[PDB]
Amino acid sequence: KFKNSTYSRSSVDVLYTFANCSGLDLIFGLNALLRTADLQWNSSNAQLLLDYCSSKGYNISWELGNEPNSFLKKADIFINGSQLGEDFIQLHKLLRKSTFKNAKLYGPDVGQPRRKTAKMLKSFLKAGGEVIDSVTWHHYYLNGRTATREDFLNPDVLDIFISSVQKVFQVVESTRPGKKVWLGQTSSAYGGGAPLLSDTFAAGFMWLDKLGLSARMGIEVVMRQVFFGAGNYHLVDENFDPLPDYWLSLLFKKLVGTKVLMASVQGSKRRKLRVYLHCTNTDNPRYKEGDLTLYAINLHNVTKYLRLPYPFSNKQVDKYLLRPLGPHGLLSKSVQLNGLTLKMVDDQTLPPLMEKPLRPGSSLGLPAFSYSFFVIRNAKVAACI
Amino acid sequence: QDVVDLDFFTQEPLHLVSPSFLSVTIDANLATDPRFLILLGSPKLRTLARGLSPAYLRFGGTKTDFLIFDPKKE
Ligand SMILES: [N-]=[N+]=NCCCCCCCCN1[C@@H]2[C@H](C(=O)O)[C@@H](O)[C@H](O)[C@@H](O)[C@@H]21
Ligand SMILES: *[C@@H]1O[C@H](CO)[C@@H](O)[C@H](O)[C@H]1NC(C)=O
Ligand SMILES: *[C@@H]1O[C@H](CO)[C@@H](O)[C@H](O)[C@H]1NC(C)=O
Ligand SMILES: *[C@@H]1O[C@H](CO)[C@@H](O)[C@H](O)[C@H]1NC(C)=O
Ligand SMILES: *[C@@H]1O[C@H](CO)[C@@H](O)[C@H](O)[C@H]1NC(C)=O
Ligand SMILES: [Cl-]
Ligand SMILES: [Cl-]
Ligand SMILES: [Cl-]
């Protein structure tokens, strides 16, 4: 199914300028299937690209290969993890000889840790782990061809992610202890996404839960597949319109800080009411050092009312509750924040993200099949100062 | 019946995520679209991308391993 294609300097420029103008840091995956007669990586084409990018002053980070666990199926070539590690060492030497001698290198972008994938990741980290700056792996919950609505709302499906994360850390701690672990490509469902689901409000339960679990478990960076493109799991559709997961992602960015904390629900039902706690993002002008950001997912079919523990019970709380714009309910491509439809002011202007201040001491209402952020003002948490 | 008490651990950060914790990708396959320059030149798209800064943008996907750089191509 997959054929070789070429790309131009123009294409490289289009990509870099997009990233640069947008304040994003570009990571470029190099082709690992360029092989010598003895199945060593042939670095000649990469050398051409590195030189070009250095010639243009492009500050770029690098990867080599995507899902090398699948190379036999995709290209009838098997590359073992030991060889891949050597290939990475060879790329690292090229970077060290380039104009950006300190450029970062990530890999190996393996799929989620089945027996054979875990084996490949282990042998890769043993061989090449010294030259990678973070370990990258990928995750999807479901096949987009067969995924159901029901699956997108099922805690038993959401929970499978926990075991994948545990298995990756088990490999990493046995080979390269303390190395940073990144989700290098992830979404709800593979095969380009689940039609009519992966681009809707319903997609947000998986996305927000994955973010919460990733942060809580030690994953440092989560790369959402995709910002824009052909698959259903895009954040922005082919008309350049943002979908509900874009607005969810923007709110997360604005409200959720780097320091991860913990929340849990008493009585120990851990299933349908899912809660996460970080310090509030210190770049948000509205809030101050010490504030907390709670986020919560309600997969029950009734509203739940959450009570904050001492010493936060009477604090002013700002609610940021997301619900779909009708008539398509959870299958809507439009979302409202605290009852206001989210939409661009114009092509140059995101809207303000308006809070709903709650009555101090009130329980936090979370409707059925919904998710919300809650900022606890003047929380004065020392860990967050 | 529908009221629930939360317990919080707030003594110290349990983990520190990157400021770029929420990052994004563009699938390698998109560079095979004839309108790639129009798509990524879109001012509307760039505005939306700016809203997620700081973030990594990872260019990659299955097509990563079927893409070859050609310095001659226009
Ligand atoms: N469950 N689960 N997940 C594991 C089953 C194997 C994953 C399916 C094989 C295809 C994976 N394939 C994922 C993705 C897609 O199919 O949407 C595509 O656009 C990206 O370019 C690839 O890197 C990756
Ligand atoms: C690597 O690939 C280039 C371009 O296809 C080829 O001409 C060169 O001889 C190859 N190098 C090795 C060491 O096999
Ligand atoms: C490249 O960019 C990263 C991220 O902003 C920065 O930390 C790094 O120092 C840069 N390197 C150079 C040589 O500009
Ligand atoms: C891995 O593959 C390389 C290259 O084909 C080979 O020389 C090496 O012996 C293999 N290692 C293992 C452990 O199979
Ligand atoms: C609402 O959820 C309960 C479980 O708490 C379930 O037994 C009942 O069938 C659900 N109602 C609907 C309409 O799905
Ligand atoms: Cl292997
Ligand atoms: Cl190391
Ligand atoms: Cl695409």
Side-chain angles (χ1 to χ4, degrees), chain A residues 62-121:
Chain A
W62 304 94
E63 294 170 353
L64 173 59
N66 177 86
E67 296 171 4
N69 47 288
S70 272
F71 283 168
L72 195 52
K73 180 205 189 79
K74 293 182 300 198
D76 296 299
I77 291 166
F78 178 68
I79 303 296
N80 63 42
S82 290
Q83 182 59 54
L84 193 62
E86 183 47 44
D87 302 336
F88 270 77
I89 287 164
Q90 297 302 314
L91 174 51
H92 190 251
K93 292 182 200 304
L94 301 190
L95 302 176
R96 287 293 285 156
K97 291 162 187 280
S98 86
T99 310
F100 294 91
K101 73 187 157 197
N102 296 313
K104 305 296 187 177
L105 181 55
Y106 309 115
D109 283 276
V110 282
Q112 61 211 71
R114 283 159 169 72
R115 206 210 70 73
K116 294 166 195 261
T117 302
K119 180 184 165 81
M120 177 176 287
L121 180 63

